């Protein structure tokens, strides 16, 4: 009984891992493992990198 509940909790951890999105792009699956840049200034090269691992 204890282990059956452990398995259900691990399944929900996996579901949250694969389901989280910004619209249609996945966030916790490994697509941001090497970060993406957002240009936060007016000139080229003035930008910040956002990194999320799986």
């Amino acid at each position: 009984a204890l282990k059956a509940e452990m398995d259900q909790l691990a399944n929900e951890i996996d579901e949250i891992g694969k389901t989280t999105a910004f619209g249609t792009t996945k966030l916790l699956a490994g697509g941001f493992s090497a970060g993406k840049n957002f240009q936060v200034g007016a000139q080229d090269g003035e930008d910040i990198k956002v990194t999320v691992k799986a």
Partner: protein, 54 residues
């Protein structure tokens, strides 16, 4: 001399007209280039997808 100066002022006003038309045309070109600059800065956003880029 008097008659030639009269005709010469007419030619000078013709030149001013030409320059004024061309100079006024270049302003809309500047305006559209500023708009394209904003679109290019907006393309540098790690939340855009291929449809937004298109």
């Amino acid at each position: 001399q008097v008659r030639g100066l009269e005709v010469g002022m007419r030619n000078a006003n013709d030149a001013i007209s030409i320059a004024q038309i061309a100079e006024g045309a270049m302003q809309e070109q500047t305006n559209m280039l500023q708009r394209m600059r904003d679109l290019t800065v907006q393309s540098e956003n790690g939340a855009n997808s291929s449809a937004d880029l298109s």
